[PDB]
Amino acid sequence: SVPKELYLSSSLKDLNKKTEVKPEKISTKSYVHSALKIFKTAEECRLDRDEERAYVLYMKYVTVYNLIKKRPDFKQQQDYFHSILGPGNIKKAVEEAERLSESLKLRYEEAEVRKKLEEKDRQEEAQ
Amino acid sequence: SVPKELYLSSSLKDLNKKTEVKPEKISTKSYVHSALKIFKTAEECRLDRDEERAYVLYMKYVTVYNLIKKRPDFKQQQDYFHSILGPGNIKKAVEEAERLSESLKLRYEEAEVRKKLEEKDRQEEAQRLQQKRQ
Incomplete structure (x- = not known):
């Protein structure tokens, strides 16, 4: 019928700008915009x-942060971009990724061992 | 509070592999996984x-497709990746994009023109309200 309102x-x-996948064709300001949304969604997850x-x-x-922080246009306005992203946010992301990696490693290891053991139980049980 | 099942x-x-942003660190297969997901969301939109x-x-x-189709491993397994992506789906994406962009170019211009006109009409009529009085 009618298209959604713009x-x-x-x-x-x-x-x-939103269609690009090469970093070479994504400006620092665009990446900052994405990063703000990625962090927000990571918090929700x-x-x-x-x-x-998450x-x-x-x-x-x-x-993304590690990518754009190497760019001269980021470096030139480091303080400005850091205040947009929020310094507490960058720190939160590192420590959350670390805490979640440690949790996921064990959860993946568990699920894999439990798998193996159930197959061992399968061979022995039907026997 | 229990975590969602894996x-x-x-x-x-x-x-x-899902955390990378540099194409050089994203396999053709990973891009293909991404592309299927992008297509399905486009269709929903x-x-x-x-x-x-959309x-x-x-x-x-x-x-994504133009980026991967140039890669040596895609070219070698060209038939497999086309079967997985769907030759119809690629053709659709291209023509939806062109169709939508023409629609949008016009809709964007319409919105900006109508905005300017409404504002000019607003000020003219305000000015007419004020002067008629005097």
């Missing part, structure tokens, strides 16, 4: 107890 | 008549 952006140009999604998002946030 | 991966190593999001996702899908 809300995402104000030009095809801004929209085109953590609160929702989705450890894998971990992937905190880790991805740190990987 | 569902997304079976190892940290596999899960780590299309049916929602959300033209901006445009972005169809274009991002085409961008």
Whole structure:
């Protein structure tokens, strides 16, 4: 019927920025915008107890930060960008990714051992 | 408070592949996984008549495909990756993107023109209200 009312952006140009996958074609300001959303979503996933999604998002946030922090246009305005991202947020992401990695390692190891043991039980039980 | 059951991966190593942003650290297979997900969301956005999001996702899908189709391993396993992605789905993405972009170019211009006109009409009429009085 009628298309949804425009809300995402104000030009095809801004929209085109969202289509890119190469870092070489993603500006520092665009990555900061994404990172803000990735961190927000990572917080929500953590609160929702989705450890894998939360971990992937905190880790991805740190990987974007590590990428753009090497750029001269980031370095030139380091204090400004750090205050947009929030210094407590960058620190939170590292420590959450670390805490979640430690949790996921054990949960993946558990599920794998439990698997192996159930197959061992399968061979022996039917016997 | 119990964590959600594991569902997304079976190892940290596999899960780590989802954290990369540099294409050089993303396998062709991982891009193909991403592309299937982007396509399905584009289709949902299309049916929602959300033209901006649908445009972005169809274009991002085409961008992913153009990036991987040049890779040696994709070219070697060209038939497999086409079977997995679906030759119809690629063709759809390209033509939805072009269709949507023409719609959007016009809708964007319409919105900006109508905005300017409404404001000019507003001020003219305010000015007419004021002077008529005097």
